Design a protein around this nucleic acid. Structure first.
Ligand SMILES: [K+]
Ligand SMILES: [K+]
Ligand SMILES: [K+]
Ligand SMILES: [K+]
Ligand SMILES: [K+]
Ligand SMILES: [K+]
Ligand SMILES: [K+]
Ligand SMILES: [K+]
Ligand SMILES: [Mg+2]
Ligand SMILES: [Mg+2]
Ligand SMILES: [Mg+2]
Ligand SMILES: [Mg+2]
Ligand SMILES: [Mg+2]
Ligand SMILES: [Mg+2]
Ligand SMILES: [Mg+2]
Ligand SMILES: [Mg+2]
Ligand SMILES: [Mg+2]
Ligand SMILES: [Mg+2]
Ligand SMILES: [Mg+2]
Ligand SMILES: [Mg+2]
Ligand SMILES: [Mg+2]
Ligand SMILES: [Mg+2]
Ligand SMILES: [Mg+2]
Ligand SMILES: [Mg+2]
Ligand SMILES: [Mg+2]
Ligand SMILES: [Mg+2]
Ligand SMILES: [Mg+2]
Ligand SMILES: [Mg+2]
Ligand SMILES: [Mg+2]
Ligand SMILES: [Mg+2]
Ligand SMILES: [Mg+2]
Ligand SMILES: [Mg+2]
Ligand SMILES: [Mg+2]
Ligand SMILES: [Mg+2]
Ligand SMILES: [Mg+2]
Ligand SMILES: [Mg+2]
Ligand SMILES: [Mg+2]
Ligand SMILES: [Mg+2]
Ligand SMILES: [Mg+2]
Ligand SMILES: [Mg+2]
Ligand SMILES: [Mg+2]
Ligand SMILES: [Mg+2]
Ligand SMILES: [Mg+2]
Ligand SMILES: [Mg+2]
Ligand SMILES: [Mg+2]
Ligand SMILES: [Mg+2]
Ligand SMILES: [Mg+2]
Ligand SMILES: [Mg+2]
Ligand SMILES: [Zn+2]
Lengths: 110, 150, 305, 59, 99, 43, 154
RNA sequence: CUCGAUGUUGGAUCAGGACAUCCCGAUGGUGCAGCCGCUAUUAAAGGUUCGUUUGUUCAACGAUUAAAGUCCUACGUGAUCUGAGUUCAGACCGGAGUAAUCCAGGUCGGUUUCUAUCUACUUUCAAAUUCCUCCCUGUACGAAAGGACAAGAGAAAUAAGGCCUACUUCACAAAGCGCCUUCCCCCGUAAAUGAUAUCAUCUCAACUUAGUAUUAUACCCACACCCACCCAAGAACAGGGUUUGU
RNA sequence: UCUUACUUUUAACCAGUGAAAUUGACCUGCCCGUGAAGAGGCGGGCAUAACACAGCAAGACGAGAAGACCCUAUGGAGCUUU
RNA sequence: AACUGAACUCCUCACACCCAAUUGGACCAAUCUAUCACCCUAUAGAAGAACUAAUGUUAGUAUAAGUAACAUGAAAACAUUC
RNA sequence: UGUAAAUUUAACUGUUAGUCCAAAGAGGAACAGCUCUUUGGACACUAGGAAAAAACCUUGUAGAGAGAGUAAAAAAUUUAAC
């Protein structure tokens, strides 16, 4: 089946500009209180999530160097320690991963 | 078109002719070439016709300007501010006389469709018709099927 | 201009407190209506021929077999009355129809999810909001005061009822499932044509008649099952055992009414009128009412002697 | 649009608002003929008796 | 082409309008359109339909007089037709002769 | 329903045309003129 | 019609679905936090919770060991399950994982989620926090609560 | 009209319509005792089978049925299907022809495209038809043989609308081979009273009865919490729930 | 008979990329009638706020190929021949 | 007993100003040339001298259509592993 | 008689595939919107009318008018006593 007649621009504008075709305004955008960048209410802040991932990647690279090969997952818990810190009483018997930087303020030692 | 063009109602300029008639043509500006063939008829109109036409119309200031031009033109200006330009290219002397006389007699209003061939500010002397014009009145202005003094 | 919901701004401490608070108010409001006859009831008129009483709203619990004393097996559907109350009365004059109407509601729902206009309606009534509201055509002598609770014992074994509910929704369906068309053969050369409508009209009219059966949305519409016999009533749990199956999925809400079939006209002479008032009832009803022909669970095994 | 200006009522009752805006009643197009029981004795007496029935006819 | 041919319809529709308007004005006085137009001619009143329509709208007292005149001439016609020639011509039925 | 076979005003089966009162009067009016023509052509 | 169909149709069929979910779960056990398309994480989350329950049965339960052998494609993770992850949740009856939606993926705009085993050593996710109890609304409700408690004791 | 193409048989699928009715309803006549028939008036809501051979439409035959209706719709319907036949290119037989080749003949084989722009349409929501069994009854009827109707009861089939307790395919569910529900009227005539026409006469006389439904009632009906999550709701959208938002 | 369930593909929605035949103009309804003889466009009626998305294939004598059947042309060509 | 009703006829003014093929006639766009003209013209002589249609030719851009259709196994430290 | 054409001379082209209506006939079936001749009309040119409408009726010579008189022009019918 083929078109019997060319569709006019008048007809086409009605189809293309029908409210159903238009982009809807989003009402769920808000400011992230921690960083001030924008976020959606139900979604994690992109700026804060990236910050966490970047530190997570650095720690994982350190874990790699300590393991030094595939199939070397430890059978004990792990703790991340930053410059100027020492193992606590509850950190004894745990693999220590040492980061050459100051503990981020948002990374509370537990 | 009528639909594809503007229109207006029949009218006059300052109620012309009511108290006195005032010729609306106010100025005529001719542009004739000394040597152009297309101005031959315009040159003959300036030699024998324009002077006698000016005597008859002392309220119209005529400006004849001889200068090089390929298309001689007459520009008519009216009291209401309308400006009309009419080419006299290759026109005969009699043709130009006819055109100039027509310009003298026109009011200067736009030559467009006139909705009505008449105009009046007092269309009614006895009272314009309304739905009660020919209706009788009833005692106490009672409406149809209206109980009085209930 | 951004939308909000009830607990959006509530703190960790206030969310449990608010839930408990509104829950307790809901329960208290339902308990305050348990004595309709001590709270200025409307006149209780006697049943007369031609009288139409109110129906109920119930939830469809499921299905169950029962056996009759003649040995025959009848499957039945359990319908539980869950927080059924009269909501509004509209007089015959203002109804726009031939009869008066009485609005009934069923099943308590969260107030945090209802429109403001509905909430203020229920606030004046003093009841928690209901999921479904239905309109029952009644005669003037059967009017009941808004806020009166309705119970399963409104119906009695041996009665016949009509049950209306939304059918199960099957979405967009082809002609074979929707209309029972035969389709076309599976082999002998059929080309990409097995479940299709075929011809939809004649060539002459050069159009398709209104009402022509075609693929489209199936189910999810109101249907009514007529002439269902009430086999049993459990007064403790407020469950009505109706013969056969009723439209809708399990846990849907159904509209239960006295059967309008001509054979069952004027059989309400012995039925509660305008309704059953358990508080008014002099002698408490047994936990189960049975139709005379039903084999009760504790009855001796059938013997054909 | 014209049909919106037409107000049909099956009986003599007309809503009060409609009654208050009425201006003129139009004459009925058909003259309603009088039933025989509606004629006054003057009218009946004015119409002549056209024939003399036999005195011995049972009728 | 439409603009050219419309000049015929304009004249036709204008006269239809005048007849409709004259008919309405005549009915307000209990006269049908043919009775007014016909009897006005018999009074040697040559007012055309355009003017008659204008008079109905803007000079209703003159129009009622014209309706009365037509009605009077119409009644004189009936009286003459019913007569056997004994009666003299009606006062408004007399025709002014020209030569 | 009520179709006329083929074209309306030709052929074997046609749409019937009836004579109105004014069609009759129109014809008689011209018959009177011709009758008078006969007379004035007789002398 | 798909009434009551609780499982998604992903991958190349039923087997591929399990393999797809297994590879995700293996990644989660090793790294303890992974990001993947939202639908796939939601599907896998149930298995990740149940895996811990099998880990709690102990490494001497042969059925648990067979389950772990199938679901963990890297065998060094099986000791971690029985000796690290399961002991960490000894005092919980469930809720071992947390799943949060993250911004759409850049390339294909896929809806994305991050999932992690609670109690890991990684930097904490920027979790959503409810409004402070000191806000205007929460203080007005605290007053209402205080008032209701005082009237009940009386 | 159409050859700068209106696709050609039968079948499948879905059927719209006419009534000159095959079955079911209501009536008049009968060489109508009854049971069966024949004929005519009225009735188009509903229904109108499965098979063997044949490409068949038909036809014959087997077994049923209350009945297996007649027609129109581009001999309805191929942008839905089919390709057995028919009607290209191969081939054989009989016949014609000097041969090429040919025949209303027969015979085997032989590619059925299209992503839908427009019109139209995509729940006319919800009153049901029919057969059989029992009974009436071995009654009415009749010499006998034979043998009803009305009322009443029961049990089925089909159709329409739903459903999952069990069975079955199956297994958080969808299904049938399973289960549940299904309700009004039909106008042809047959009779009184009684004029024109002082009997009579059912009346395009005034009128009375069989004899009629405003088709009944039923269903539907309150709505900016709504970012988000769940769903028996769903293509998207919409809809229900969240007092089930760690 | 007589269909049903599930998986994959396709599908629909989001994101990227982005063809083709087709197209006089279109402000592109239904019925009956009419007519170059089968009407969305004419006559008489009826219907009728506006605009998407998904399906359908009854019509647009739908698209595609200047009908291959048929006839015609003092148009061709292959083949046979007394 | 009348009225309505044409491009018929009258009325005011004007008048060459409503048939295919075909035929006669009056004008004329732009271009070049001769001589004029000199904000775009005149008299003549010339000619590749005028395009709403050839399934026309070339180029541009629409319509169908943001439609048909097309593509990257998974996680991760990008090492690696599955 | 009322009229203004006519023949001749010179020079050419196009038309030579025809439709309905009335009338006289032929063929066919006293069928065809059928076929074939004859006389005339209309159409293939205008406008009005017969519902829409080439072929029936009215009417033709060309413009403007917001005058006027007309032409053709609408379908009638209702029934069985003795
Ligand atoms: K005909
Ligand atoms: K053809
Ligand atoms: K066969
Ligand atoms: K269309
Ligand atoms: K199945
Ligand atoms: K009689
Ligand atoms: K189609
Ligand atoms: K006519
Ligand atoms: Mg559903
Ligand atoms: Mg099948
Ligand atoms: Mg194929
Ligand atoms: Mg197939
Ligand atoms: Mg006129
Ligand atoms: Mg015809
Ligand atoms: Mg997939
Ligand atoms: Mg074509
Ligand atoms: Mg049918
Ligand atoms: Mg019949
Ligand atoms: Mg066919
Ligand atoms: Mg087709
Ligand atoms: Mg074949
Ligand atoms: Mg041979
Ligand atoms: Mg083969
Ligand atoms: Mg064959
Ligand atoms: Mg096909
Ligand atoms: Mg398709
Ligand atoms: Mg019986
Ligand atoms: Mg009698
Ligand atoms: Mg008598
Ligand atoms: Mg698609
Ligand atoms: Mg896309
Ligand atoms: Mg084309
Ligand atoms: Mg037609
Ligand atoms: Mg569409
Ligand atoms: Mg067309
Ligand atoms: Mg085609
Ligand atoms: Mg051809
Ligand atoms: Mg040659
Ligand atoms: Mg003239
Ligand atoms: Mg003239
Ligand atoms: Mg020039
Ligand atoms: Mg050229
Ligand atoms: Mg061009
Ligand atoms: Mg072209
Ligand atoms: Mg499309
Ligand atoms: Mg696609
Ligand atoms: Mg000749
Ligand atoms: Mg002919
Ligand atoms: Zn942030």
């Amino acid at each position: 089946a083929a078109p019997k007649n060319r569709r006019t621009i008048e007809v086409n504008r009605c189809r293309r500009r029908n409210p159903q075709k238009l982009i809807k305004v989003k009402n769920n955008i808000d400011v992230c209180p921690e960083c001030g960048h924008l976020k959606q209410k139900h979604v994690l802040c992109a700026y804060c999530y990236e910050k966490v991932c970047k530190e997570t990647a650095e720690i994982r690279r350190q874990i790699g160097k300590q393991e030094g090969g595939p199939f070397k997952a430890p059978t004990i818990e792990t703790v991340v320690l930053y410059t100027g810190e020492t193992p606590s009483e509850q950190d004894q018997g745990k693999r220590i991963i040492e980061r050459d930087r100051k503990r981020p303020s948002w990374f509370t030692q537990n | 078109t009528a639909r594809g063009t503007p229109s207006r109602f029949l009218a006059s300029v300052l109620h012309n002719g009511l108290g006195r008639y005032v010729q609306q043509l106010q100025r005529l500006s001719f542009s004739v070439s000394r040597d152009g063939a297309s101005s031959r008829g315009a040159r003959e109109f300036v030699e024998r016709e324009v002077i006698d036409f000016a005597r008859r119309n002392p309220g119209v200031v005529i400006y004849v300007n001889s200068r090089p031009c390929c298309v001689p033109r007459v520009v008519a200006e009216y009291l209401n501010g309308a400006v009309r330009e009419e080419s006299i290219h290759c026109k005969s002397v009699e043709e130009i006389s006819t055109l100039v006389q027509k310009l003298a007699d026109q009011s200067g209003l736009d030559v467009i469709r006139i909705r009505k061939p008449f105009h009046t500010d007092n269309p009614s002397i006895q009272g314009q018709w309304h739905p009660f014009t020919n209706k009788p009145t009833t005692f106490r202005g009672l409406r149809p099927r209206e109980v009085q003094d209930p | 201009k951004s939308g909000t919901w009830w607990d959006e701004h509530l703190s960790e401490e206030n969310v449990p407190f608010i839930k408990q608070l509104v829950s307790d108010e809901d329960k208290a409001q339902l308990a305050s209506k348990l004595c309709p006859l001590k709270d200025e009831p409307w006149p209780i008129h006697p049943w007369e021929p031609g009288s139409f009483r109110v129906g109920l709203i119930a939830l469809k619990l499921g299905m169950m077999p029962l056996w009759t004393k003649d040995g025959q097996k009848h499957v039945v559907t359990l319908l539980q009355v869950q927080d059924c109350h009269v909501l509004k009365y509209t007089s015959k004059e203002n109804c726009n129809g031939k009869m008066a109407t009485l609005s009934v509601g069923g099943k308590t729902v969260s107030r945090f999810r209802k429109a403001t206009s509905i909430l203020e309606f229920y606030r004046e009534l003093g009841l928690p909001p209901k999921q479904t509201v239905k309109i029952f055509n009644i005669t003037d002598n059967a009017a009941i005061k808004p806020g009166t609770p309705l119970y399963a014992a409104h119906f009695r074994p041996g009665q016949y009822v009509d049950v209306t509910a939304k059918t199960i929704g099957k979405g967009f369906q082809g002609v074979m499932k929707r209309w029972g068309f035969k389709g076309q053969p599976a082999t002998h050369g059929q080309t990409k044509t097995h479940r299709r409508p075929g011809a939809v009209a004649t060539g002459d009219i050069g159009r398709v008649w209104p009402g022509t059966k075609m693929p489209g949305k199936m189910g999810n519409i109101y249907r009514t099952e007529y002439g269902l016999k009430v086999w049993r009533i459990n007064t403790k749990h407020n469950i009505i055992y109706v013969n056969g199956s009723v439209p809708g999925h399990k846990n849907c809400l159904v509209k239960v009414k006295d059967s309008k079939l001509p054979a069952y006209k004027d059989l309400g002479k012995n039925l509660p009128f305008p309704t059953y008032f358990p508080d008014g009832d002099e002698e408490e009803l047994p936990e189960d009412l049975y139709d005379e022909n039903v084999c009760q669970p504790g009855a001796p095994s059938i013997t054909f002697a | 649009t014209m049909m919106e200006r037409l107000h049909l009522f099956p009986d003599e009752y007309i809503p009060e608002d409609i009654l208050k805006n009425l201006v003129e009643e139009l004459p009925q197009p058909r003259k309603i003929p009088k039933r025989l029981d509606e004629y006054t004795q003057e009218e009946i007496d004015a119409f002549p008796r056209l024939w003399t029935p036999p005195e011995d006819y049972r009728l | 082409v439409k603009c050219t041919k419309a000049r015929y319809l304009k004249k036709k529709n204008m006269r239809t309008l005048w007849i409709n308007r004259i008919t309405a004005a005549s009915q307000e006085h209990g006269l049908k359109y043919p009775a007014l137009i016909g009897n006005l001619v018999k009074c040697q009143v040559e007012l055309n339909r355009k003017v008659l329509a204008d008079l109905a709208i803007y000079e209703p007292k003159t129009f009622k007089s014209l309706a009365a005149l037509a009605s009077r001439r119409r009644h004189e016609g009936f009286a003459a037709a019913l007569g056997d020639g004994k009666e003299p011509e009606g006062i408004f039925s007399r025709v002014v002769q020209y030569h | 329903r009520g179709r006329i076979p083929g074209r309306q005003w030709i052929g074997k089966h046609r749409r019937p045309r009836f004579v109105s009162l004014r069609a009759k009067q129109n014809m008689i009016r011209r018959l009177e003129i011709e009758a008078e023509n006969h007379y004035w052509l007789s002398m | 019609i798909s009434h009551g169909r609780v499982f998604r149709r992903m991958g190349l069929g039923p087997e591929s679905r399990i393999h797809l979910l297994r590879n995700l779960l293996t990644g989660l056990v090793r790294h303890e936090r992974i990001e993947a398309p939202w639908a796939r994480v939601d599907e896998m989350r149930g298995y990740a919770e149940k895996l811990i329950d099998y880990g709690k049965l102990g490494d001497t339960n042969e059925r648990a060991m067979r389950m772990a052998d199938f679901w963990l494609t890297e065998k060094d993770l099986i000791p971690k399950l029985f000796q690290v992850l399961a002991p960490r949740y000894k005092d919980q009856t469930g809720g071992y994982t947390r799943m949060l939606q993250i911004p759409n993926r850049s390339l294909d705009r896929a809806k994305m989620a991050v999932i992690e085993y609670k109690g890991n050593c990684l930097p904490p996710l920027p979790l959503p926090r409810r409004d402070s109890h000191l806000t205007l609304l929460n203080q007005l409700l605290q007053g209402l609560r205080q008032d209701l408690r005082q009237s009940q004791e009386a």
